[PDB]
């Protein structure tokens, strides 16, 4: 999964967890996302990964406080999703990376880039 994050499960139950921010409070702990595409946490603790595919320009909202129900809501403004996985990835700001942007991007699609012509 990743070096500074916690691998848990295998196959389709493959997920990665962040430190439980043990600081204090009781808000939550071990916020985990699942790695396998179109698979999402089924419980708030993400004990098991469930299957609920979306379409392009949509994310997967998950209401419920013990077992999740799933609503395939559209992508927020400033984000995109070009797959069935249903995750709102942030736009690639070409300007801060080195390039200009040829097409700005939308909910369906991320931005492509144009340069410096010298």
């Amino acid at each position, epitope marked *: 999964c990743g070096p500074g994050k916690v691998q848990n499960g295998s196959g389709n139950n493959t997920r990665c967890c962040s430190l439980y921010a043990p600081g204090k409070e*009781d808000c939550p702990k071990e916020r985990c996302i699942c790695v396998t595409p179109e698979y999402h946490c*089924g*419980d708030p603790q993400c*004990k*098991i990964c*469930k*299957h*609920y595919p979306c379409q392009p320009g949509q994310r997967v909202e998950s*209401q*419920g*406080d*013990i*077992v*999740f*129900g*799933f*609503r395939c809501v559209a992508c927020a403004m400033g984000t995109f999703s070009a797959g069935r996985d249903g995750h709102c990835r942030l736009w690639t700001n070409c300007s801060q990376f080195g390039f200009l942007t040829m097409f700005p991007g939308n909910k369906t699609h991320n931005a492509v880039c144009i340069p410096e012509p010298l």
Partner: antibody
Amino acid sequence: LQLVESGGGLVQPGRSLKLSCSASGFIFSNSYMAWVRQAPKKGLEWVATINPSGSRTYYPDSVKGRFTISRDTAKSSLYLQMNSLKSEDTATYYCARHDLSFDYWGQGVMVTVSS
Amino acid sequence: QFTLTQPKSVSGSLRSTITIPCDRSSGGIRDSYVSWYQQHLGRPPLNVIYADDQRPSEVSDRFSGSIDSSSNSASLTITNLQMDDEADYFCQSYDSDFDVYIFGGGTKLTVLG
């Protein structure tokens, strides 16, 4: 795991009861806990949700505003403060734990709201 | 939004596949936990499946769940039906934050003699 319901019985229309469910058996405050009822010979009707902390309460409908669910780690007890009872609230009331999905259940306590 | 429907009853021979259909009834949220519970006599319900499959321990491998069709159609399958599998079977769902928790109306499974 053992869950024992108590506090059911015969009660007049418009009255109140408090059910208790004693537990230990697992990780009470470290899990959710549900109330569900059933008229004898009929189906299961979901009735109550309590946050493991006890901060938030979730209810269905026919009893929203009339019933109440809460927890007290003291003796792992639930708190069904049922008020303004009607004949339709007559049923066997079961406790259990929403944890992952109603893990364990009690034997149930009968509430009879009759004239 | 609250809805759930089940067949009133299903009757099958021993050592035969048993299918108990639970339909979303227009909820439209076909995929979420669709737990299956079993009630015998005046005893409390026993959890047979949570999470669509992954039967909890003890319950016999012969009980399996699946969420296919995706056209609203969870199902509980009992393969190789046994005499101790006589019971009312209930599906319960989610809407855990969509709104409320709800059981289907139950399905009566009778054995053969």
